Amino acid sequence: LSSTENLKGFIEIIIPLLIECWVEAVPPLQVMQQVLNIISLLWKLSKTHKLESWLRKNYLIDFKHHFMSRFPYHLLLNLTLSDIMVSLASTLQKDCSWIEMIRKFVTETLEDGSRLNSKQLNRLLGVSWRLMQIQPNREDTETLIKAVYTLYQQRGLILPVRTLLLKFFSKIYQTEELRSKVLSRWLAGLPLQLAHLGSRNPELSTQLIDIIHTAAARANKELLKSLQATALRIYDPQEGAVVVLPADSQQRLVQLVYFLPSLPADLLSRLSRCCIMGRLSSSLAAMLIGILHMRSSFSGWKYSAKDWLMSDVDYFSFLFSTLTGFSKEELTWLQSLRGVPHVIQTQLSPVLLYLTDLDQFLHHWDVTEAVFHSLLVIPARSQNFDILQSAISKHLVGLTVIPDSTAGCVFGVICKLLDHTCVVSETLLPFLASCCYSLLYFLLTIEEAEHLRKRDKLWGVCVSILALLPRVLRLMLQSLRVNRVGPEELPVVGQLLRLLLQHAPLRTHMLTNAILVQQIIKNITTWLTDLHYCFNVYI
Amino acid sequence: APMEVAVCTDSAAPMWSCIVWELHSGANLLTYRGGQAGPRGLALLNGEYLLAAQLGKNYISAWELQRKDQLQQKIMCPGPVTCLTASPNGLYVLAGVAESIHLWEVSTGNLLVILSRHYQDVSCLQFTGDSSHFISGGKDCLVLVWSLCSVLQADPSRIPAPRHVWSHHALPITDLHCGFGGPLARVATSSLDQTVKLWEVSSGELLLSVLFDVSIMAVTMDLAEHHMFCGGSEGSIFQVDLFTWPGQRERSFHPEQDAGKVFKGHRNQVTCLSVSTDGSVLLSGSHDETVRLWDVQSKQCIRTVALKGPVTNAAILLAPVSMLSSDFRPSLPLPHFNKHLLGGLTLRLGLHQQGSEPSYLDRTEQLQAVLCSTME
């Protein structure tokens, strides 16, 4: 039967004979059923329009009445008959009778199907799909959708059946582009399932996020409500659905933030805490900031009041809390500890510097470029600079120990947002001077094998902030008393002075305060030979 | 030699609203006074009327090309107008209201159809370079390819459907560029997900999926499809080379070279791009209140014309006879554009034979034949 004609030549030969056997079957129990099987066998063997229409128009008379079986008469006997009968375009009006009773039969078996195996259940699902396809009227399909949903909601089903049902539904949703209450009620229960399915079934979660994204792309109002309700749980730093899934399904679930209706303070904070830490990759940290900027109030568009809910203050809080990213609890605990071979101590600057591992510093320096760009576009630079200064004077100046990442990031923000109209406050300068001196001491005294690559960036930041603002340099030079400093720090201050002398841009703001340079030098005597000669530099 | 202009508009409009300045001289040619324009909301109609949308408000202004003042005709729509586009021939004016795709007719002035398939706003609207297909895309991550034949002669009870449904993006669309041709053209849709895809309008298949680093907000292509200048959300104007063709379908920019294929000099988004005719100067708007010309062959700036406020619309045209002449009274007045859904064509005859006059030799031969016939 390999050839089309050989199969076709066989077609007219056998089937009339099984009809003869069909009459002989009923005027055991297999007889008719095996006749039912081989027909579908060869029908499937067909898979064409002309041949299928030929079979239709030639065997309608037999199939209408002679091929009927005992519907009441474990169910495959009627299932195969229904399959072939449906398998027999635009003939619904001439066939509505058996279409209706076959729909009744399929609904009846769908309603009470619990012990059914996977194969004939898949066959029945395909039969129902073909039934709804051949009858594209919503009212008729509502009852079938309700039956299949009640099957979906039964108290405990095996995983393959659940996957097949979800695939069929997906293939019943991802075709609307080509608003049933029963269809939309199952959609609302998807975010809860996604939140509960943490890491057990990554593939099912991928299917769930795909269908959720597709539905949210159409503003299905019965889904966005549940999405907003469960946004707290699904977006969680410690454990949730953004950090535990593989790198693939955590891209769609961060791109989904655009379609989220409302972003209050709670969600914004627990989403900043998701992107500050090392749980989320640095590559997928600029995307989140870009989305939050495009959903902000300074993008350039205006839309519904409920969305675009970046009400200025919350946006600035998020931006600051990701610029100086560290939670309050861990920062306070870090403040609690005092005395480790990990924190640089200085008796001249009353600010210590907690040291961070290289990976954390690299992530916090690769995530801060997006913050720089987002805070650079803001119109009326004076107002946002004032907001940043208020945030610094509220959360940072009172701190005793600051991380080696914030000490560079805040300096970068200050040196990148500075312009003519910007004015630095008077209660902030001592903190900057102390932090700058502590940073310089840290750069000078670098004696593990890991904390050496984070040197050029810090030196560049320090020299830039020193050059841009001369008042911090004057304050640091003034706060360079040597009477209290012991002999242990005697060479490091001289080395710092020599290095500051060597660098060229820190000259015009430096030679103005020349008396303090010599005053420290004489007190040092009461490595030094190079410093004495180095006052006059290429002149 | 031809003359190339550069129409520019600003979103603040203190004094002017649409300044037209010469490309290689920088001098003004025509200015216009009226309400603020709208993003993707400028379209010259038949080379005579400069229709423009309105920012936020729901209506469309209309300036005669040789007139500094607004006309008293205002196209009105039942909702906030988002984008506008006039067909290249000039017969049809097509605009997008919220999610609808309201379509007009310039000749009679009727409102033929109101198509409606997008699930959210429509934020880009382009016409294929022969006015046979028009591509529409919106904030629902969908790009549809309609057809001017099927959506015009469809029954009132047939609810016309798009020819192609392109759904591959995961974020709202931002810009399109339908090249020359017709049923053989190519589209260059770009979304917010950091991708720029080049589709085919004949069969409806993907061809390219370049993935950038920052969100793309504007795409333009050379008229012969040699370069694909994709804008950025940070200022850079990335450039893809379609004739080198490494040989795959899903490329990535960093493996596709860098620092020698990126225009730089902008400090904010670039929601405007257009390449000149010969393909040697590129005009790009921005949100940092600057419209500057580039030097695509050498990736250098030429001039940095600075507008006021964000730049909404900016493009390079081939100056018609309208702007060169000084009076050019329009051939036909703009009709009364209806706002409700529905023979009587209004047109000037004797235009299908313009220039088909007898030649000198033909008239001389006819005269000689008449003389010879009279002699006999």
Curated annotation (Swiss-Prot), chain A:
GO CC term (a single one): nucleolus
Main localization of the protein described in the UniProt heading: nucleus
Coiled-coil intervals: none
Places the protein is found: Nucleus, Nucleoplasm; Cytoplasm; Nucleus, Nucleolus
Keywords: Cytoplasm, Nucleus, Phosphoprotein
Quaternary assembly: Component of some MLL1/MLL complex, at least composed of the core components KMT2A/MLL1, ASH2L, HCFC1/HCF1, WDR5 and RBBP5, as well as the facultative components BACC1, CHD8, E2F6, HSP70, INO80C, KANSL1, LAS1L, MAX, MCRS1, MGA, KAT8/MOF, PELP1, PHF20, PRP31, RING2, RUVB1/TIP49A, RUVB2/TIP49B, SENP3, TAF1, TAF4, TAF6, TAF7, TAF9 and TEX10. Component of the 5FMC complex, at least composed of PELP1, LAS1L, TEX10, WDR18 and SENP3; the complex interacts with methylated CHTOP and ZNF148. Component of the PELP1 complex, composed of at least PELP1, TEX10 and WDR18.
Role: Functions as a component of the Five Friends of Methylated CHTOP (5FMC) complex; the 5FMC complex is recruited to ZNF148 by methylated CHTOP, leading to desumoylation of ZNF148 and subsequent transactivation of ZNF148 target genes. Component of the PELP1 complex involved in the nucleolar steps of 28S rRNA maturation and the subsequent nucleoplasmic transit of the pre-60S ribosomal subunit.
Similarity comment: Belongs to the IPI1/TEX10 family.
Name of protein: Testis-expressed protein 10
Gene: TEX10
Swiss-Prot record, chain B:
Protein's UniProt name: WD repeat-containing protein 18
Gene assigned in the entry: WDR18
InterPro entries: G-protein_beta_WD-40_rep, WD40/YVTN_repeat-like_dom_sf, WD40_repeat_CS, WD40_repeat_dom_sf, WD40_rpt, WDR18/Ipi3/RID3, Wdr18_C_dom
Native source species: Homo sapiens
Function: Functions as a component of the Five Friends of Methylated CHTOP (5FMC) complex; the 5FMC complex is recruited to ZNF148 by methylated CHTOP, leading to desumoylation of ZNF148 and subsequent transactivation of ZNF148 target genes. Component of the PELP1 complex involved in the nucleolar steps of 28S rRNA maturation and the subsequent nucleoplasmic transit of the pre-60S ribosomal subunit. May play a role during development.
Alphabetized UniProt keyword annotations: Cytoplasm, Developmental protein, Nucleus, Repeat, WD repeat
Endpoints of the signal sequence: none
Subcellular location, record wording: Nucleus, Nucleolus; Nucleus, Nucleoplasm; Cytoplasm; Dynein axonemal particle
Highest taxon, organism lineage: Eukaryota
SUPFAM superfamilies, per the entry: WD40 repeat-like
GO cellular component, one term: dynein axonemal particle
